């Protein structure tokens, strides 16, 4: 396969508004929401059909209960953080955890927490220790590091249990996740050269411009990879054209094992 990843995100808000939840949790295979839960519905529900079709209600019943507990754990941690920061008002607590299974079989794992959208605590599954970005986070580091067993716990889950899930989820959405739709690439004038690409999945694509065989990475203006809405993405990458001297420009596009070159005349 290509490089796949599994992620769970948790979001907590201190004093939300009327409609806003206080707790949200979403899971992602690669770039696909697969599971969702919030403090309103109070239910973990699938977000990909191929998730619903292969995970039985037992699975969703068990994890509904677990997030309810986690929702309250996440509120408790937030209250604690915000008291140590001496912060009034509404504030944001974020958690992300997951793993990647690279093409050559090697794997990675990560776990980190955020406060008001900044880094707070970044786990190191190899030295088995937390990294604190300040002294509120230093306090939580020593509390968590004192319970050596819960660190060995997170290591095993990141390196074996996260990956074990990811493999299972890949077979569940094999048709979705392992398909390859190559991109349609053109060139347009706007005086700049625009190399536009659309209609492709997976969303990992490199698009550069080259002058006569040498790249110009500081002169390239890169576009962002945007969702189209039908399952595919589209991106672009421009360069400014020299009015005083001609030049052999050539757009290059790498994607899912195939590299293409568009020479402009």
């Amino acid at each position, epitope marked *: 396969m290509r490089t796949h990843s599994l992620r769970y995100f948790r979001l907590g808000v201190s004093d939300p508004i009327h409609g806003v939840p206080e707790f949200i949790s979403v899971g992602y295979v690669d770039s696909h929401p697969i599971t969702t839960y919030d403090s309103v519905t109070r239910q973990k529900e699938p977000r990909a059909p191929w998730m619903a079709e292969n995970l039985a209600p037992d*699975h969703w*019943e*068990r*994890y509904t*209960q*677990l997030l*309810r*507990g*986690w*929702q*309250q*754990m996440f509120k408790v941690e937030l209250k604690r953080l915000q008291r140590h920061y001496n912060h009034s008002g509404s504030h944001t607590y974020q958690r992300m955890i997951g793993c990647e299974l690279l093409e050559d079989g090697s794997t990675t794992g990560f776990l980190q927490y955020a406060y008001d959208g900044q880094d707070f605590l970044i786990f190191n599954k190899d030295t088995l220790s937390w990294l604190a970005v300040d002294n509120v986070a230093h306090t939580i580091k020593q509390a968590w590091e004192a*319970n050596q*067993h*819960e660190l*060995l*716990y*997170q*290591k*095993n*889950w990141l390196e*074996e*249990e996260c990956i*074990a*899930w990811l493999k299972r989820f890949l077979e569940y959405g094999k048709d979705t996740l392992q398909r390859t739709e190559p991109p349609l690439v053109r060139v347009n004038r706007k005086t700049a050269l625009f190399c536009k690409a659309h209609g492709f999945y997976p969303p990992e694509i490199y698009m550069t411009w080259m002058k006569n065989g040498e790249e110009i990475v500081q002169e390239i203006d890169y576009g962002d990879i945007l969702p189209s809405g039908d399952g595919t993405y589209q991106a672009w990458a421009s360069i400014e054209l020299d009015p005083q001297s001609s030049n052999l420009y050539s757009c290059h596009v790498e994607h899912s094992g195939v590299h293409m070159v568009l020479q402009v005349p």
Partner: antibody, heavy 108, light 116 residues
Framework: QNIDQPTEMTATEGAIVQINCTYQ??????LFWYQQHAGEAPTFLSY??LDGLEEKGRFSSFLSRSKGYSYLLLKELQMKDSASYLC??????????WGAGTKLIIKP | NAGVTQTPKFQVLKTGQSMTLQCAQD?????MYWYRQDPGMGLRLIYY???????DKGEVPNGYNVSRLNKREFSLRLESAAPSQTSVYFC??????????????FGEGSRLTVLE
């Protein structure tokens, strides 16, 4: 899911005894040992999650995830260690699966 | 520092009686459980309560029910007692469910015997 530990073991006071616990489970999130004296409530003994051997006093617990098997090792046996030792495995969904226990019986 | 307090320590019951066992924890835990211990079997969950505000069935819930009264109290009820429900029932508590090294603190026990 399935856990197996032997029903009872007899050893002699001041010796060494090794209580095996094999398991086949859906996932794996850690292994516990619980001590339960006859008539009384189980208390927590040990917790293993990565491979290797963990000493805690004169008790030691081991784990090989690959072979899917833990053992509890009691050194210099005394009479007060005559209890049941229950093995417990946390599965992929964090459900504890319990073995039947092992009645440890010490000859004085 | 009382720990897990369950009552009664002993009960005798006639087929069809109602019965409610009590459990409290003074440890400010969040997850509470009800197990039953039988000869030859490993412990078996009856019901559990992951957090004050939720409950759910365990492995063998038929003929039981529970109610999370508050953060400290988790009670087991037997609707229509039955000779098969003769067992020792342990209450248990842990700080959180889902935490991997969080162990279970157990109560003294309840020895129940349903007779004809």
């Amino acid at each position: 899911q399935n856990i197996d530990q032997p029903t009872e073991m007899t050893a002699t006071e001041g010796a060494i005894v090794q209580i095996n616990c094999t398991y086949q489970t859906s996932g794996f999130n850690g292994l516990f040992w619980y001590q339960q004296h006859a008539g009384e409530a189980p208390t927590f003994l040990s917790y293993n999650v990565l491979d290797g051997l963990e000493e805690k006093g004169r008790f030691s617990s081991f784990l090989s995830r690959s072979k899917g098997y833990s053992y509890l090792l009691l050194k210099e046996l005394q009479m007060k260690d005559s209890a049941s030792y229950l093995c417990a495995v946390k599965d992929s969904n964090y459900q504890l699966i319990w073995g039947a226990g092992t009645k440890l019986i010490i000859k004085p | 520092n009382a720990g897990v307090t369950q009552t009664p320590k002993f009960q005798v019951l006639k087929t069809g009686q109602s019965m409610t066992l009590q459990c409290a924890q003074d440890m400010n835990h969040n997850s509470m459980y009800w197990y039953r211990q039988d000869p030859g079997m490993g412990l078996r969950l009856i019901y559990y309560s992951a957090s004050e505000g939720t409950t759910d069935k365990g492995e063998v819930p038929n003929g039981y029910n529970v109610s999370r009264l508050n953060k400290r109290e988790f009670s087991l009820r037997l609707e229509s007692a039955a000779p098969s429900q003769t067992s020792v029932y342990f209450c248990a508590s842990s700080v959180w469910t889902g935490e991997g090294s969080g162990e279970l603190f157990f109560g003294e026990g309840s020895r129940l015997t349903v007779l004809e």
